């Protein structure tokens, strides 16, 4: 028995259309699915106020920087959603790859066929289709769902989760200005900062329901000129090749200095005209042990943290704004557009459900530990956690995915995990998603594994699976060089502990976090070596 299709792709985001693309490019025979009615994934989805990149718009633009669509005009440095929509419109139009892809459709299980090496995979529970490698692209963020709080559906005014905000016929959110209306926002991480500011513009009242304060840095968003477009579009053989350099693909590098090999004095200075400057410079273009060693963090995190105290006039509301939880740049830094100064507004309140955790939602508002607040709105900025999760993944012996990293994913080159056979997992925390510039590093990964695909069909190949060895090596480099940052005891559940019933311990972390031009290096090293690491035939 043989399979219909040589790839099947699950998401429409950035990463799997271009990956359709490729495998439909090569000359082979894609299907790709997705839940949603269009292209887009996350720029589809998010249509929250506020909603802007973080890496600049010329940078995260790997379909313009590749020469897909190299006439696409930015109009700002980070585009909002509304224009990265229209971006990732355009290169599918460029790419004519909606006419591969079942819209509307969610896969619902993918099991593997051990006597056929394909994989069955089902669509709503109904449909099957099958392909020799399962490709999924289902996002390094998972699902829009009602956080863990009780009473959610007794409230009696308007609910929004950030994730699915309501539209009018033109696409565009709707229920967006709060003229009269007392709103609370829950969650203050890149959505709720973002909301924030916004809200406040209209809002009678604005509650921030905060549970822990991020670090937060000024993104500097501007309009992008005519001139500067076209002189960045004639620098765009330099710039992918910049970005394909760094660490994380953003268009920034360390310093290489240390931050004790400059006074005081200077790393002021240093740090004065980075905080200034517009997008990721301040944590990108750092010292080069920023995030290795204790001392350096704390002069930046020192530095933000004088700078908050500078944009909120109360002192008590900026000392609860600034974190000492955790070390400056262990999570994804927020960027924000006046977002400390909302809080010096007189309409705008922010509530530590730290110290009063949020019992239930009621019909009237919230309910905290020691004090209700009647609320017309709730905005729910609460997150997403893994994509894969929510479909029920069979291996080899009809093994669960689930089951099989439930001590922590384990893979070889963040691509495969043993146990499944010819099923590429691209872009999520386990192969570097959580700090990459991802228009660019899912894309460049997106390309090897076509190569791979295609290696396997030049040489009649039809099975791909990791060495036990290979998978477990690749698997403890990625917690050791996690381990020597500072982001293994800030984030402590980024680290699965699992000390078995033998005796032994398994150490993995959920984040890989290498230099993506060092783990792309080590991918060509094996590709080149025949797959050396993965078992074919
Ligand atoms: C608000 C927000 C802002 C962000 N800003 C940046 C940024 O500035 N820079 C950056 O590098 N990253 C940013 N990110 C991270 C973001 O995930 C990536 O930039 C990128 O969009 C990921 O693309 P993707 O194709 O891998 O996944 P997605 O864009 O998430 O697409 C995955 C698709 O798969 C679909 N899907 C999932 N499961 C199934 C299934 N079972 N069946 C059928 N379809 C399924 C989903 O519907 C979704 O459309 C941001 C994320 C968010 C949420
Ligand atoms: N380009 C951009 O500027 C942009 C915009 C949005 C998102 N993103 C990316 O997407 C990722 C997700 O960001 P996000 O802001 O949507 O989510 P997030 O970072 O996970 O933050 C969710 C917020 O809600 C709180 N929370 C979660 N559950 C709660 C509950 N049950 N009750 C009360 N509070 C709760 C969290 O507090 P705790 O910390 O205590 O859990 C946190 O403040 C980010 O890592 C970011 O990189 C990027
Ligand atoms: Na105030």
């Not at 449909?127 to 007794?154: H, N, Q, W, Y």
């Not at 973002?194 to 329901?209: D, M, N, R, S």
């Not at 977002?339 to 019992?359: F, M, S, W």
């Not at 290979?470 to 990625?478: G, I, P």
Request: proline share 5%; with cysteine.
């Amino acid at each position: 028995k043989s399979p219909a299709l040589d790839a099947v792709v699950i998401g429409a985001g950035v990463t799997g259309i271009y990956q359709a693309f490729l495998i439909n490019q090569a000359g082979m025979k894609v299907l790709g699915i997705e839940a949603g009615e269009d292209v887009g994934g996350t720029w589809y989805w998010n249509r929250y106020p506020g909603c802007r990149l973080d890496t600049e718009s010329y940078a995260y633009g790997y379909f313009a920087l590749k020469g897909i669509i190299p006439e696409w005009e930015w109009s700002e440095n980070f585009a909002s959603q509304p224009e990265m929509l229209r971006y990732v419109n355009r290169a599918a139009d460029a790419m004519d790859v909606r006419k591969h892809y079942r819209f509307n459709t969610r896969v619902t299980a993918a099991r593997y066929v051990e006597n056929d090496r394909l994989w069955e995979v089902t669509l709503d529970n109904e449909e099957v289709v099958t392909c020799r490698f399962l490709i999924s692209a289902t996002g390094p963020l998972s699902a829009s769902r009602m956080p863990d709080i009780k009473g959610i559906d007794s409230f009696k005014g308007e609910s929004f989760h950030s994730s699915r905000w309501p539209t009018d016929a033109e696409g565009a959110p709707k229920g967006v200005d709060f003229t009269g209306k007392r709103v609370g926002v829950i969650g203050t991480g890149a959505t709720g900062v973002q909301i924030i500011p916004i809200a406040a513009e209209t809002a009678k009242e604005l509650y921030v329901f905060q549970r822990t304060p991020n670090w937060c840095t000024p993104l500097g968003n501007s309009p992008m000129s005519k001139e500067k477009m076209d002189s960045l579009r004639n620098r765009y053989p330099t710039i992918l090749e910049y970005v394909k350099s760094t660490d994380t693909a953003f268009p920034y590098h360390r310093d290489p200095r240390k931050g004790t090999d400059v006074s005081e004095s200077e790393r002021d200075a240093f740090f004065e005209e980075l905080y200034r400057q517009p997008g990721y410079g301040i944590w990108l273009s750092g010292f080069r042990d920023l995030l290795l060693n204790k001392e350096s963090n704390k002069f930046l995190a020192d530095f933000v943290a004088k700078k908050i105290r500078q944009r909120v006039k109360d002192p008590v509301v900026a000392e609860k704004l600034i974190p000492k939880d955790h070390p400056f740049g262990a999570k994804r830094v927020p960027m924000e557009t006046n977002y400390y100064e909302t809080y010096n507004r007189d309409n705008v309140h922010l509530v530590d459900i730290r110290e009063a955790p949020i019992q239930e939602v009621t019909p009237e508002g919230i309910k905290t530990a020691d004090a209700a607040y009647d609320l017309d709105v709730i905005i729910y900025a609460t997150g997403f956690d893994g994509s894969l999760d929510r479909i029920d993944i069979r291996g080899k012996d009809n093994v669960r995915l689930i089951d099989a990293w439930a001590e922590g994913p384990s893979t070889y080159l963040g691509l495969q995990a043993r146990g499944f056979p010819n099923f590429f997992t691209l872009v999520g925390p386990h192969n570097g998603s959580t700090f990459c510039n991802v228009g660019v590093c899912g894309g460049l990964q997106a390309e090897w594994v076509l190569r791979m695909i295609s290696y396997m069909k030049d040489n009649g190949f039809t099975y791909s699976e990791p060495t036990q060895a290979a998978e477990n090596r690749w698997t403890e480099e990625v917690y050791a060089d996690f381990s020597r940052t500072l982001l293994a005891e800030a984030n402590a559940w980024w680290v699965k502990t699992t000390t078995k019933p033998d005796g032994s311990v398994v150490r993995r972390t959920l984040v890989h976090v290498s230099g993506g031009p060092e783990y792309r290096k080590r991918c060509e090293q094996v590709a080149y070596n025949n797959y050396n690491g993965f078992e074919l035939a």
